[PDB]
Design an enzyme around this catalytic site. Sequence first.
Site, short mmCIF file in Angstrom:
data_model
loop_
_atom_site.label_atom_id
_atom_site.label_comp_id
_atom_site.label_asym_id
_atom_site.label_seq_id
_atom_site.Cartn_x
_atom_site.Cartn_y
_atom_site.Cartn_z
N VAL A 96 0.86 -1.21 -0.07
CA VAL A 96 0.20 0.04 0.03
C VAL A 96 0.89 1.28 0.10
O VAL A 96 1.82 1.37 0.73
CB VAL A 96 -0.70 -0.04 1.25
CG1 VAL A 96 -1.59 1.30 1.48
CG2 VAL A 96 -2.01 -1.16 1.42
N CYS A 97 0.61 2.32 -0.80
CA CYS A 97 1.13 3.64 -0.93
C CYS A 97 1.07 4.08 0.50
O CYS A 97 0.16 4.08 1.03
CB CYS A 97 0.56 4.46 -1.84
SG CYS A 97 1.37 6.26 -2.05
N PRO A 98 2.23 4.67 0.97
CA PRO A 98 2.39 5.30 2.40
C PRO A 98 1.62 6.66 2.30
O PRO A 98 2.46 7.65 2.83
CB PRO A 98 3.85 5.20 2.72
CG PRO A 98 4.50 5.30 1.44
CD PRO A 98 3.50 4.71 0.44
N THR A 99 0.62 6.86 2.07
CA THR A 99 -0.04 8.21 1.46
C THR A 99 -0.07 9.26 2.82
O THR A 99 0.39 10.26 2.62
CB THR A 99 -1.54 7.90 1.19
OG1 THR A 99 -1.31 7.32 -0.19
CG2 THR A 99 -2.12 9.43 0.87
N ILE B 88 3.44 10.43 3.61
CA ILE B 88 3.79 11.31 2.61
C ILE B 88 3.26 12.72 2.60
O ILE B 88 3.68 13.95 2.51
CB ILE B 88 3.57 10.84 1.09
CG1 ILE B 88 4.45 9.33 0.90
CG2 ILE B 88 3.68 11.87 0.11
CD1 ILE B 88 4.18 8.84 -0.54
#
Lengths: 167, 167, 167, 167, 167, 167, 167, 167, 167, 167
Positions: free
Chosen positions: G48-51, G54
Site C-alpha cells: 500500500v502507498c504510504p499516502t 507522505i
Amino acid sequence: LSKAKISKPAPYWEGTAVIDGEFKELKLTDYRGKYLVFFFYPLDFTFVCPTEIIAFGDRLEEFRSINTEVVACSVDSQFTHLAWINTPRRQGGLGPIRIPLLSDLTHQISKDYGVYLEDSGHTLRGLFIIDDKGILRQITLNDLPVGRSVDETLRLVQAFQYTDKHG
Amino acid sequence: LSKAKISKPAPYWEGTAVIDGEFKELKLTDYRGKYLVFFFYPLDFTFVCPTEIIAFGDRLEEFRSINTEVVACSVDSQFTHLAWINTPRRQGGLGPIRIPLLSDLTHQISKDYGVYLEDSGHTLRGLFIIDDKGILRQITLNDLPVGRSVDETLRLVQAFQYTDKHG
Amino acid sequence: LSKAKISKPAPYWEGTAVIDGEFKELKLTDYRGKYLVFFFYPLDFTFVCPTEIIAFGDRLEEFRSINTEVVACSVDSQFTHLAWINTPRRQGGLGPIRIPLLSDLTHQISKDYGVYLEDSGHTLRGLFIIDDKGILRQITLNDLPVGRSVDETLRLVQAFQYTDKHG
Amino acid sequence: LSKAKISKPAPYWEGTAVIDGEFKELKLTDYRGKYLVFFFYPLDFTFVCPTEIIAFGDRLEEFRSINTEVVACSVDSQFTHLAWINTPRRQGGLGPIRIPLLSDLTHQISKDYGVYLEDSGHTLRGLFIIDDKGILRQITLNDLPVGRSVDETLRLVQAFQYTDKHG
Amino acid sequence: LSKAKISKPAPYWEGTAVIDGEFKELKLTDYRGKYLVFFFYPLDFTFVCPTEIIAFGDRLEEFRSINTEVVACSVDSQFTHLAWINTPRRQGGLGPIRIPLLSDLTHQISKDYGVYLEDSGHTLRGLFIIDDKGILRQITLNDLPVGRSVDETLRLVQAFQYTDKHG
Amino acid sequence: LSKAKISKPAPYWEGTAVIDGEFKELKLTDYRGKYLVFFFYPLDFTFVCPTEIIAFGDRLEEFRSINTEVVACSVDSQFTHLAWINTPRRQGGLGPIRIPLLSDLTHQISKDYGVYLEDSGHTLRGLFIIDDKGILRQITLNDLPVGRSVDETLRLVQAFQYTDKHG
Amino acid sequence: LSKAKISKPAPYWEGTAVIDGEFKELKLTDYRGKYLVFFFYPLDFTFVCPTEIIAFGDRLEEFRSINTEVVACSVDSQFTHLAWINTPRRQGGLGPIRIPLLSDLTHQISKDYGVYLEDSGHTLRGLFIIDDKGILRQITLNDLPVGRSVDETLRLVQAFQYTDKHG
Amino acid sequence: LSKAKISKPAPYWEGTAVIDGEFKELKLTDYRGKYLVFFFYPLDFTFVCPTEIIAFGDRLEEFRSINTEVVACSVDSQFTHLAWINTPRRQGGLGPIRIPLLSDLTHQISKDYGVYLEDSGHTLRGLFIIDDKGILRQITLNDLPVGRSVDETLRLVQAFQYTDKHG
Amino acid sequence: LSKAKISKPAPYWEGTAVIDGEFKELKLTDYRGKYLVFFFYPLDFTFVCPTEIIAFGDRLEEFRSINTEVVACSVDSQFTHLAWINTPRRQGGLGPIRIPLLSDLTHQISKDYGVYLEDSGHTLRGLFIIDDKGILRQITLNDLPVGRSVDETLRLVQAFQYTDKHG
Amino acid sequence: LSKAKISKPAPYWEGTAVIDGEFKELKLTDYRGKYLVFFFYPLDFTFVCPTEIIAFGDRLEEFRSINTEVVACSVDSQFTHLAWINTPRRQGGLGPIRIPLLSDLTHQISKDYGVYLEDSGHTLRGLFIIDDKGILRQITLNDLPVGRSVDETLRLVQAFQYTDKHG
C-alpha cells in the site's frame, strides 16, 4: 477466646457495679492485696430464688475475716442489678446485699473469662479464685442447673492461703 | 487447645489403664449409661501422700450406689501406675486401689481436656463430671497445691442427677 | 523436627536428672571438655530387666578412664526415675546407679534428638556420641526390641578420640 | 529431607549396581523375604584402604547363612565402581568383591536415606538394617573418620530376627 | 535453573581440579585476563575412547598462543579424575593430560551452566567460551552422542578476539 | 522462559515465511521426516554483508542431499524479508535465496527458543538442530559479533544421523 | 497495559530514529516547548502507498509554522526505516522524508501508548497530540484499513493552542 | 477498566434515552445492521453553545443516507436531557433534536468506554465508530476544550464502509 | 455490620418477647401481611420516664386500624422486661403495656439492624418501618438524648400505604 | 460503604453548590459553630412538585433563628441545579430558593452518607442532623415515595440543642 489461665494473672476487668445501692466503677486491680472470689451467674429476675448469691452475701464475713472479698457478675445492666437489689427477697428479689454486683453489659468480661454462652446471651455458672498478687488459682464451671457451695469456696481459699504461707 | 466445653459431648479418650492390678484398654464410651467423675492429678511417686486418690477409692461405693464411676489420670505410663499401686502406702506408694489409673503418656488426653502444663510436662489438678449421655456438665481446675473434695464431687453429681430427672 | 545433625553442635538440652539418689539440674554444656555418650530408652518399670542400662552403669569406668561420661534419658518423671533406682534389681528395678537418669517429661529433648514416637508417647532406643567440643559425631537408632552394646560404644568413642588426635 | 524412619517402610531405591563385574539393575524390593544390610560409604578411589567393604565381602557367608544380604552404595557412577573393582587392591583399588556396589549418581538415594552431605557432594558413613517385609529397623550414622563393625551388624541382625520370631 | 546467559558474567564456579596429577583449588576468576574454553563431558571410565579431551590436550598450545586456557569438567570426584588420568589410555584410561579436570561432585556447577541431566546424574556435552572480563560469549550444547571440534572452538575464540579488538 | 530442551520435542512454531518470493504459512511440523537446521539472526538491512545466511543458501544442497532442510528466522516482518531478498547482494541485500525466511514479528518464537534480547528487541545468533522425529539435538548460541559455520553445522548433522543409524 | 491518559504527561519514550537519512537518538523530552503530533503506523515495505506519511511530510511547514513537530513510529528497526526511505517511491518505498521515523523494535513504546496488537506484532493506526508542557491532549485510534487526515490533525492542534491561550 | 478495544465487539450498553421528547429504553444491539457513531459529551446546561451536538443533529441525514445512526451520551439524567431539549437554542438550550440523548446516570457506560473522569464526575469528549456487526472500528478521545468535526466523522465512516466492501 | 437496607427484605429476627405479661416466641415473619413499626430503646429500669414507649402503647389503636403493629426491643432479658412491666409507673417501672417487648439478649438483632453500641453494650434509639411484604421502607436513628414521635411515625406509615396503593 | 455514624464526626464533604443563583464552593466545615440539616433528594427536573425543598426554603428563618442552616444535595451537576432554579415553578422548575443546592456529581458524598442507589445512579431521600461541633446526631432514610417533614426536623434540632445545654 478465654484469657483465664491458672497461674497467670487473672484477666483484667473493669465496669460499673452496684455497691451499697450506688453505681461505682470497679476494677480487678482494686482487689490487689486481697484474695478475690469472682463469680458469674446467668440473669437477674428469674423465677428461681437467688440462693447462691444470698449465701455468699449472708456469709460474707467468713471471707472478709480471712482477707478475701467477693464480687458477683452477670450480663445484666447496672440499672437491672439495682432494680433487683431493690426487690424484696420475699418477692424473689435479691434484697439489700453487701457484695458488689458488676454489670457485664458488653459481654467482654464474660468472654475474657470463658463463661459466655453465645447462643443464649448470658453466662453459665463460673467461679474464679484470684490471689492477692492477682494470679488466677482456681476455675469452677457449672452447667446452668447446678449452684456453687460457700463451704467449698472457703475450703479452697483457706487451702491456697495455707499453701502460700507454708510453701 | 482444649476441646472440653460444658453442654457438649466430653472429648473422646482411650488408653491403657491399670484396673485391679491389670492392664486394660479403657474408653470414655465404656461409661455410656453412667455418670463419670474423670480427674487428673500431676505425677505418681511424689513425696506427698496421695490423699485425694485414696479418698475417692475408700468412698467409691457412694458413687456406685448412684450409678457413677470414677477414673483418675496422669501423664505417667501404665507401667509407672502399676509400680505405684504395688508400692505399699507406708513407703510412699498408692497401695491397692479400686479406681482405674489411666495413662496419658502421649499427653493428648490432657491437652484435649485443657489440663496440660506445657512448661512442666504434666497436668494441673483437673476434675470433670460427665453425664450418662456423655455430655460434659462440670469443670473444676485447681492450681497444683490444692486438692479435691469427695463431698463436693458427690453434691455436684447428685444435683446434676436431680435436675436431669425433675428438669 | 530433629535438630541432631552429624558434625554440628549437638542440640542443647537441660532438665532434672537423678544423680546419686538426688534431683539435680543437668545441662549438655556441663559436659564440655569431655566426650559424652547420651542415650534414650523407652520406659522405666517395664517387665524386661534393664540389662542395657545396667551394663553402661556397671562398666562406667571404661568410659571415665578415657575422658568420657554417660547420661541415660527417658520421658519418665524424675520421681519415677528415683523410684526405679530405689527398686532392687532382683525385683526388676535398676537399683543404685552411677549414671544420671535425665527426665524428659515435656518430650522436648526427645523431639530435638529425633527419637520421640508420637503414637506411643515415649522414645525408641537412640544413642548419640558427642565430643568434648559439643559436636555430634555419631547417631544410633534401634527399633524397640533390640538393645545397645557397651563394647560397640567404646569402639566408637576410642575411634573418634584416636582420629581427633592423629586425624 | 530424609524419608528413613524406624518402623516404617525403608525408602524405595533403584539403580545400577556392579554385581560380579557386570552392570545390573537393582531394586530395594529385590530383597523382600530377606534381611538387608544397606550401607553407604563416601567415595571410590580415595587414599584410604577400603577395610570395611572388604570385611563385609570377606564375611558375606555369615550374613547369607542367616537369610541376610548386603549392599554397598556411594554417589560414584557404576563406571567408577567397575574401574575401582578392576583395580588391584595393592594399586589403590577394591579388587574383586562379592557385595553389589550400587551407584547413587543422581544423589536421590542418599538424600532419601538422610546421609548426603550437601557441601561435599557425597555421603557420610550410614548403615541401615531392613527386614524381610521391607521395614526399616536400625539406623547407624558415623561421621567420616570412623568405620562400621561386621560383628556389631551381625549382632543387630540376629537380635532383630530372634525378636521377630520369639518376641 | 541455568544462570548461563550470553553477554552476562559467566556463572562463578570453584572446586577441586586435577592439574598435572595433583589436586588444586580452581576458580573461574583464576582465568581473568585470558579467554577460557570451559567444557563438560558426561563421565570418566566409560567404554568410549575420550577422543575430544585428548584432542584439546594435544592441541593446547594453539589456545595458549592466543591467550586462551581450557578446562574440562564432569560430575566425577577429583579422586576419580586422578585414577582415570593414572590409568593408561590402552587400558580404558585417559592417561596423562595437560588440561585441568575439574570435579563437579555437588552438581552445582553443572546446574548453574544448564548442562545437568536430572534423570541421569551427569551432564550432556556443553561447551562455553568466556572472555578475559569473565563475560559469557558462546554456548554450545550437544546431545550425548556427538562431540566437539577443536577447529570450530579455535575459530570462535579467534573471532571473538578479533571483534573485541577491531569491532 | 525458554522451552528449548535437548532431547525433548523442539518447541512448536508457525508463522509467515518468504519462500521463493512469496508469503507462505510455515510450521515446524512441516519438516517431520527430515532433519532441520533452524537458525536466528538479528536484523535485515544492517550494514554488514549477510555472509552467513548467503553461505547456507548457496550450499543448501549439502543439506538437502542428506535429508536436511534449513530455515532462517528474524524478528523482521515478512514484508521486510521480501524487500531484503529483492535488494541485490552488491547493494548489501540478500538477493534471491532458496532458504525460507521466517518472520517472528510477535517475538514469541524467539522467546520460545531462548534467543530473544529484551533490551534490543531482536535475537542473538542462535542455531538449533532438530531431528526427523522433531526432537531437539543441538543448541548453538553466539553473541552478536560472531557468525556460524556451514561446515561445523554439516559435521553435527552428519554425526547425529550416523549415531541415529549405528548408535 | 496502556499508560496514555488524556490530561496526564504523555508516556516517556526514547529510541533510534532516522532523521534526514541518519540514525539519531530521539526522546519525547526533546520536544518540550513545542506541540507534538506523535503517530504510529503498522509496517514498512507493505504493498500500500504510504499516502498518509507522505502527506504529513509534504505539509510539515504548516505544523512548524505553528510551533508543532511531527514524529512517525512503527515496530520496524531503524535499519528497515532507512532502507524504506532509500527505496524510491515508484518502487514501493517511502523516498526522502522530512519527518523522523522512530523505531519501536522492543515494542515497549507501542505498549505504553496502547497501540500494540498482541496477535500481529505491530501497531494499529494511532495518533497522539502532546502539548508543549508534555501533557497528552488527544488520542485517535483507527482500525488498520483507515488513514489519518492532516487537515483534521491541524484543526485539533490549532484548537488546543487557541484554548491554551484564551482559557 | 475500559472494555473498548478496536476490532472487538463494542462494549454492550443499555439505558434510558430521550428520543423525540420521550423516554425510551435503548440498547447497543438496537443498532445491529447499521453503523453507529456513539459519542459522549461532558454536561447538559453549561454556558457554552452545544455546537457539536447541534451539528450532528442538523446534519443527521449525511449519516442516515449511508446506513449510519448517531447517539449522544452524558452522565446527566434523562430528566435533565429532556429539560435541556425543551430549552430553546437562543437560551443556550439544545432545542428539539433528532439524535437520542442517552443517560449514563450510574456512570457504568462511561467507565466501560474509558471516557469517565473520576475527579470530575462526568466524561471527556469521546467518540466511537461501531460497525454493522457491532465491532468497534475507531476511538477518538479529546480533552475537554476541543470539539469533534462532523466532516471528519463522515470521512471515517465512509472509509470503513469502502474498506468493508472492497477488502 | 448492618444488614438493614431500604427496599430490601428487613433483616430476619427471632427471640422471646413479653406480650400481655407472658413470654412468647416472636419473629419478624409473624408480621407478614401487616406493616410493622420496629423500634429499639437503650435500657429498662433507667431513671428517665419511658414516655415514648407509653405513647406508642396508648395510641396503638391508631396503628392497628391501619393494619400496622408495633414492637419495641432492647438488649435486656425477657425476665427484666417482665419485671419492668410488673413495676408500677410511679416507681420508675413501665407498668402494663400492650406492645410486645422483645429481648435482644445476644445482641445479634441490634447488630443486624445497625443500632448496637459496642462501647456501651446497648442500642441507640433506632426505628424501622417494615411493609406488609417484609421490605424495609424507613430507617430513623437518633442519638441517645432524643426520642421518637408517634405522629411522625403515623405520617410515614400512612404515606407508604398511600403510595403502595396509588403508585 | 457508609461512613455516617451517630456520635462520630459527620463525614467530610466538599463541592460546588448553587447559592443565590451563583456557583460557590461549599464544604461541611463551613458550618462549624452551627447546627446543619443536610439532606439529599433524588433528581432535578422530575415530574413531581419539589414540595419538601420549597417547604425548607419557605421556613428557613425558623432554622436560622435557632443557629441552624439547611443544605440540600442531589447527584445532579451544578449547571443542572442552576437551570432548575432558573425554571419557573409553573413549568416544573424549582424557582428562586434560599437553600444551597449542592452537586454530588462524583457520587462520593452520597456513598459516604450511605444514601446512594447503585442500580439507579441517584440517592434515596436521606436527611442528616449535624451539631455545631460537626458530630452526627440523627439519620433519617426514606424510600423514594415518601418525603420529609419540616416540623419533625425542627423538633429534632430543638431537642438536640435542649439536651446539649441541660445535660
